[PDB]
Amino acid sequence: FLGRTGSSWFKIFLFYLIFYGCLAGIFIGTIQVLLLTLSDFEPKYQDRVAPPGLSHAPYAIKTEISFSISNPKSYESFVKSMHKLMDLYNESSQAGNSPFEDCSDTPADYIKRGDLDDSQGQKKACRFSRMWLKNCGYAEGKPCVVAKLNRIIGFYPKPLKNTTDLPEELQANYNQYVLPLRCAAREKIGSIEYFGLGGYAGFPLQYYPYYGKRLQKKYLQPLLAIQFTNLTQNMELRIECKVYGENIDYSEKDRFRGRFEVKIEVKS
Amino acid sequence: EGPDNDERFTYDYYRLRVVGLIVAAVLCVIGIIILLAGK
Amino acid sequence: LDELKKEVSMDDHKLSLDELHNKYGTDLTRGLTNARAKEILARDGPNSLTPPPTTPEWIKFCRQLFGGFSILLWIGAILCFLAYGIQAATEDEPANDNLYLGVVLSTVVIVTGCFSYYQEAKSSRIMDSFKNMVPQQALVIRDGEKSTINAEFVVAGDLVEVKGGDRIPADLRIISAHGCKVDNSSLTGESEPQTRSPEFSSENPLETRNIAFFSTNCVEGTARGVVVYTGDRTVMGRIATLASGLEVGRTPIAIEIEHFIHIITGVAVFLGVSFFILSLILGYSWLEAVIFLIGIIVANVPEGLLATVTVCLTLTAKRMARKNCLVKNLEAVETLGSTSTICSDKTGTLTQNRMTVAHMWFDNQIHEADTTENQSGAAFDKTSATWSALSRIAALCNRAVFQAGQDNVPILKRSVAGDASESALLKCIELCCGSVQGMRDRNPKIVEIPFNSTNKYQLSIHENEKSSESRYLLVMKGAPERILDRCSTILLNGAEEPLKEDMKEAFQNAYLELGGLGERVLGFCHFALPEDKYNEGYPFDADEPNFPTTDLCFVGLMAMIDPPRAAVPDAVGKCRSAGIKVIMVTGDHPITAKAIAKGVGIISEGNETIEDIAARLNIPIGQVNPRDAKACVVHGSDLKDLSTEVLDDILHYHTEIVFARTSPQQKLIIVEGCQRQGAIVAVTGDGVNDSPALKKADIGVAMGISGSDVSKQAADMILLDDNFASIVTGVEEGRLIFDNLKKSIAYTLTSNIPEITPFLVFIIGNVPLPLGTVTILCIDLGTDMVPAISLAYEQAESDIMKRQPRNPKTDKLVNERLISMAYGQIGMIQALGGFFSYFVILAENGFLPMDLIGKRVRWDDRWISDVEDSFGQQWTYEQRKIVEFTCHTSFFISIVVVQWADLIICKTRRNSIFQQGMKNKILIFGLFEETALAAFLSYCPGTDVALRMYPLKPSWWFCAFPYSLIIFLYDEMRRFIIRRSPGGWVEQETYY
Numbered sequence A: 001f002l003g004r005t006g007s008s009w010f011k012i013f014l015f016y017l018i019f020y021g022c023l024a025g026i027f028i029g030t031i032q033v034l035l036l037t038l039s040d041f042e043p044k045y046q047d048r049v050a051p052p053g054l055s056h057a058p059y060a061i062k063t064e065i066s067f068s069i070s071n072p073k074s075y076e077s078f079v080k081s082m083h084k085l086m087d088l089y090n091e092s093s094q095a096g097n098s099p100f101e102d103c104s105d106t107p108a109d110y111i112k113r114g115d116l117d118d119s120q121g122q123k124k125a126c127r128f129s130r131m132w133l134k135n136c137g138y139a140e141g142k143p144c145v146v147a148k149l150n151r152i153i154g155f156y157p158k159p160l161k162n163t164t165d166l167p168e169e170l171q172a173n174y175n176q177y178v179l180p181l182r183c184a185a186r187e188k189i190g191s192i193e194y195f196g197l198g199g200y201a202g203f204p205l206q207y208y209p210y211y212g213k214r215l216q217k218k219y220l221q222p223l224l225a226i227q228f229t230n231l232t233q234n235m236e237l238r239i240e241c242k243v244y245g246e247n248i249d250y251s252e253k254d255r256f257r258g259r260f261e262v263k264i265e266v267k268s
Numbered sequence B: 001e002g003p004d005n006d007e008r009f010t011y012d013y014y015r016l017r018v019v020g021l022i023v024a025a026v027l028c029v030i031g032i033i034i035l036l037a038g039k
Numbered sequence C: 001l002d003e004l005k006k007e008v009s010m011d012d013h014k015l016s017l018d019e020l021h022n023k024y025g026t027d028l029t030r031g032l033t034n035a036r037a038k039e040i041l042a043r044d045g046p047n048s049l050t051p052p053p054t055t056p057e058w059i060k061f062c063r064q065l066f067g068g069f070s071i072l073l074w075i076g077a078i079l080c081f082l083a084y085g086i087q088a089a090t091e092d093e094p095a096n097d098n099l100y101l102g103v104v105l106s107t108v109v110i111v112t113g114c115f116s117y118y119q120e121a122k123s124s125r126i127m128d129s130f131k132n133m134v135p136q137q138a139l140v141i142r143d144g145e146k147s148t149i150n151a152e153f154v155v156a157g158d159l160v161e162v163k164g165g166d167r168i169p170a171d172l173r174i175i176s177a178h179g180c181k182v183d184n185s186s187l188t189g190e191s192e193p194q195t196r197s198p199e200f201s202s203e204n205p206l207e208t209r210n211i212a213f214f215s216t217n218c219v220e221g222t223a224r225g226v227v228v229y230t231g232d233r234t235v236m237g238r239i240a241t242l243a244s245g246l247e248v249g250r251t252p253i254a255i256e257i258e259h260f261i262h263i264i265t266g267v268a269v270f271l272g273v274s275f276f277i278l279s280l281i282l283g284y285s286w287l288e289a290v291i292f293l294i295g296i297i298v299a300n301v302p303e304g305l306l307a308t309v310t311v312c313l314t315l316t317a318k319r320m321a322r323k324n325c326l327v328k329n330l331e332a333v334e335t336l337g338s339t340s341t342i343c344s345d346k347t348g349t350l351t352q353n354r355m356t357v358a359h360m361w362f363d364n365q366i367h368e369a370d371t372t373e374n375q376s377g378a379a380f381d382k383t384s385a386t387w388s389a390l391s392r393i394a395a396l397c398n399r400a401v402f403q404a405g406q407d408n409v410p411i412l413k414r415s416v417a418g419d420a421s422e423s424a425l426l427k428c429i430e431l432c433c434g435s436v437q438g439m440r441d442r443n444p445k446i447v448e449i450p451f452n453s454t455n456k457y458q459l460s461i462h463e464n465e466k467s468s469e470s471r472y473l474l475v476m477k478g479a480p481e482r483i484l485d486r487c488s489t490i491l492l493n494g495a496e497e498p499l500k501e502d503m504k505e506a507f508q509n510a511y512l513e514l515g516g517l518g519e520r521v522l523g524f525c526h527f528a529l530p531e532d533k534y535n536e537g538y539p540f541d542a543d544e545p546n547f548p549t550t551d552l553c554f555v556g557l558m559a560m561i562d563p564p565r566a567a568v569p570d571a572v573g574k575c576r577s578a579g580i581k582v583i584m585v586t587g588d589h590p591i592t593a594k595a596i597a598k599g600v601g602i603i604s605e606g607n608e609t610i611e612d613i614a615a616r617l618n619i620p621i622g623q624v625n626p627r628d629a630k631a632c633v634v635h636g637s638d639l640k641d642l643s644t645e646v647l648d649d650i651l652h653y654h655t656e657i658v659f660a661r662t663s664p665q666q667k668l669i670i671v672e673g674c675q676r677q678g679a680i681v682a683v684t685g686d687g688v689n690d691s692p693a694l695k696k697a698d699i700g701v702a703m704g705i706s707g708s709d710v711s712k713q714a715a716d717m718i719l720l721d722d723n724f725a726s727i728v729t730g731v732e733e734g735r736l737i738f739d740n741l742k743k744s745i746a747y748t749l750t751s752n753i754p755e756i757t758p759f760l761v762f763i764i765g766n767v768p769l770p771l772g773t774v775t776i777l778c779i780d781l782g783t784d785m786v787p788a789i790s791l792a793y794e795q796a797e798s799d800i801m802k803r804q805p806r807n808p809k810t811d812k813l814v815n816e817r818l819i820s821m822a823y824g825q826i827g828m829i830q831a832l833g834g835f836f837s838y839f840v841i842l843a844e845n846g847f848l849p850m851d852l853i854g855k856r857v858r859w860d861d862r863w864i865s866d867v868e869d870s871f872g873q874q875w876t877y878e879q880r881k882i883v884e885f886t887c888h889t890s891f892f893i894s895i896v897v898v899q900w901a902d903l904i905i906c907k908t909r910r911n912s913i914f915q916q917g918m919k920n921k922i923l924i925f926g927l928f929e930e931t932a933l934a935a936f937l938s939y940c941p942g943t944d945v946a947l948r949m950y951p952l953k954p955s956w957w958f959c960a961f962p963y964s965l966i967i968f969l970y971d972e973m974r975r976f977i978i979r980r981s982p983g984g985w986v987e988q989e990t991y992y
């Protein structure tokens, strides 16, 4: 033929069949032992998610949400993702004492449901009403963005203490139980309005620590609705929403490390 | 610890780099020694 | 074009002096007119040689920039700029990826260009050396007056004059001469002075006395002649053009390189476009379809391989430089290993090029002297009183002297003023009797008759050094038979005795044997003149026989020859044991050529020519079956009337071939004949008459000390110490480097698979990219470099000089067996070890292997800063990318770790590491430096930006260890099978 005879062509096939078969069987074996060394409830390493990311619902083309108020299908793209998220926080999804629980309607302290063990059933998560998100189809004019803190197993988000000076200096400082979120731009051509649990501009600490998908399915993380009823129009406004805390840090590279990058433009 | 389990989300990449560079250097020296056993 | 120049020349030495003048419109006495000479100048053109048109270095460099790998790397470099252009227009990408990768790849092509350019070097100044043989000026007779003119202004027809010490300015017809002798070594390779006279003495113009040639010099006397040829039209000017004009051609090693380039280029374009369409079918945007292709290019092309080859060659050439063997062309480092036939000059190559005493006949006994340079033999006789009598004649009846200031150099190597035979005798006595000058001071010469054409003897009368005599001793030497007709007694073991027919017959026997050995034989005799008949003041007349020259005492015979170099016989046998055919090709006479052939082992004992059979059986040569003769001796005059097909039959039908009295073109023809049969041929030589053959040879080797400038220009290799044993070393080195290149190539190729497979699974699996493009270049250009080179220092696995020369048609540098092992077996194991570490990194950070399938879409989505892992955690864009790049880093390090084992297995093709050992210090160096480089690239701060290399955790380093070990075991088991059964299965499938 090309290389060899039929007899040789066969033997080279019988070899590579057994050979690659063995190699596949060995590869799988090493994957088995790897998995055997891992927990079902907690990942081996967590230093790469460490400082929590802050992500929002409006799917930004490039950290930007520009549209026209005087146009219907101009914002119907951002309403798709906005709906996708909030559709999960339905009351019909949170039914019965299992696996949900009614928690303080005001920001409270942490809740420990034991260890990362299966020695108990599904760890009961705090309910969250999308109805706590006042004012927010969504904002056809002047968007109503929804913030979110990235989930990390066993992470206890710790707010800053009012020992020294603060950006939003001491205003509504629920020091003991709220992780604040203050959006900014100089360039003050807007109108910041925050909505959340208990009416505070933060995340209620009663939703922590997260026990993971395996030990807490259907779990709901707290949301923080932000509305920009800015009196300006037809210009790119670089708005940055920042979260503050002891376990919260940022990076010049990762522009989502505990903060937002939104470029709103109501070009109408 | 409990709420004070910050060490869980931390890794000493600084020491690791110091050690890694020490090792790389020493392996580089060892190599020179064996090569220079005759030039 | 040069087929005309490969033919024997035609001449006009047969014409009379007068007749020759009519042909050139010339005067025998007055010479040409100033006007007629200038007319002929413009007519024929200058008496000069024009160098052939060369290829500029520009075109030579750029021709390498387009050879398979460079072509693919160019397509990659441009395709980078393509994707970059498409980006800069569509979505403003502030990155530098495609732009920088395009710059890097273009640089890789340029630098790789320098390496191949360095390897494909051609240092040739043939025509320049020939031009150096034309004198600046010549002496001509114009308008009846002699004047010096620019030799280029010399034309056919003018009257030229030459004298001892000057170069022949052009081909001349001798019309007048006085004691003129010439050095025709340019045409023959033999430096013994040849007389020139107006008389025609041979039909063959290269043998007649009435022609003098350009490229030769007058050694003594004076001559006048008419110019018959000028410039390019001279006999050796044509040889110049032939030699300088010959097409170089591709070396065996070069052909091998191009061959695997085709193979690897083939699989590259195959998988390249095979997966380019396979991606579009899967619905991949052309934006991405090209990015994957660039990666495929980089994965398939072994970027550092061609440069490795060059370095391995260079390092092999450095070792040979250290044995006095200079390599002018890097590729010639290997040709000697692939050589199946050596065509060797005799004089100054196989031989020392110096008349040396070989045997002596005295006391009715043949004695043998030591002919070797360094005198590696033993003594023959010292005791016999006869010896001292013969020794005295050899010293006394000798007019040769050592040049001043030689006392530093060895006797046999020092320059001597005199003819070759007298120098030989001088050096013979000086060696075994001490200072000859002393013997010539103790015995003052009073009268002598120098060797005469008519007398055929030379005699001398000396004052006997003996005090009790202080009388007159007569000594003489000459033609053995002439000396015999002048002898009455023979000095036997001390005492004289009558010359009976018995001893006279033993003389003839001794004389015939020595002459049969191709040796020049001389007779020696002396006579103690009677005291009473010769007073202490008796005057001797040299002009008229004033003393007896008959009834003298015969002392002995001495024989001499230009002997082989000490190492030559043994080197010839060694070449022949390695299955190399050795042919002699010489301008010298057949009797001498044949005798040295037997001396060095070109013709082995018992082997006969058709002429030998005929003489032994006493029958006509036509009655001899030529197939009964394995040896042959072909004279150039017969070679001339043979067609190439008939020359091919001679080459095919004889194992032991001697081509004697060959011209320079004839040497070229014999070389081409050998090549025509498909053989790789080496030429060894030292003269300008070897230049065409040396050029045409696959490899020409010139002698460094004895070699002429031309020969060393025409060669690929120079033996700087004239050590012929270096050929044996050269062939051995050549074979070793050929095997080691295979090892180094397999090693380099093996790591291609773990660079290809990640890109494929990236498409078919939709997982995060396991390894990057930059990461690949860190391997092929970084870590693999020193290890791959180090394989050039591997010792032989068996006695390579015991095997036959490779068949260049069947035995390739890269075959299917190499690809099967490198690509199908070992590289495949490396790929898995890479993937394993990849799955380990991701799974330990929260992305278990199961959830990875079909996630790249969301993984690469720059706007999704919340991807969910297996544990329910959310990752930003840059966070998961850090893990991904950490995966690139550990996959990279996995390659290094699996290359550890590969380096050790590529060490040997057959033998076990437990047999060959670990005595390669460069290889061990490679292991340490490779690992140092990898660690540095991972842990050095800032490398995460320039190369996207991230620090690895200690446990990460050990992921591929079990795969590294399986490689070592697998290959060790496999080679154990090879050795345990030379049959073929494992052998014919995987044996590189």
Ligand SMILES: *[C@@H]1O[C@H](CO)[C@@H](O[C@@H]2O[C@H](CO)[C@@H](O)[C@H](O)[C@H]2NC(C)=O)[C@H](O)[C@H]1NC(C)=O
Residues within 6 Å of the ligand: A086, A087, A088, A090, A092
């Ligand atoms: C989650 O809540 C949303 C609230 O808008 C539900 O949307 C309803 O969709 C139905 C049918 O398309 C409409 O008739 C209603 O007007 C919507 N709102 C309400 C309050 O009922 C959505 O269907 C819910 N999703 C799930 C899975 O239950």
Ligand SMILES: CC(C)CCC[C@@H](C)[C@H]1CC[C@H]2[C@@H]3CC=C4C[C@@H](O)CC[C@]4(C)[C@H]3CC[C@]12C
Residues within 6 Å of the ligand: A003, A012, A016, C757, C760, C816, C817, C819, C820, C823, C824
């Ligand atoms: C990533 C995976 C799926 C690709 C696997 C490719 C396999 C099938 C390839 C890789 C190397 C290949 C072999 C390389 C060498 C030879 C020897 C030659 O004389 C005949 C073909 C043969 C035997 C090839 C057959 C196919 C082969 C085994």
Ligand SMILES: *[C@@H]1O[C@H](CO)[C@@H](O)[C@H](O)[C@H]1NC(C)=O
Residues within 6 Å of the ligand: A134, A135, A229
């Ligand atoms: C939000 O909606 C409420 C009614 O639910 C209305 O009273 C109020 O004006 C709205 N706020 C703004 C800022 O438009």
Ligand SMILES: [K+]
Residues within 6 Å of the ligand: C694, C695, C696, C697, C698, C699, C700, C714, C715, C716
């Ligand atoms: K050559």
Ligand SMILES: [K+]
Residues within 6 Å of the ligand: C302, C748, C749, C750, C751, C752, C780, C784
């Ligand atoms: K490679």
Ligand SMILES: [Mg+2]
Residues within 6 Å of the ligand: C189, C345, C346, C347, C348, C349, C685, C686, C687
């Ligand atoms: Mg010679």
Ligand SMILES: [Tl+]
Residues within 6 Å of the ligand: C298, C299, C300, C301, C302, C303, C752, C755, C776, C780
């Ligand atoms: Tl490569």
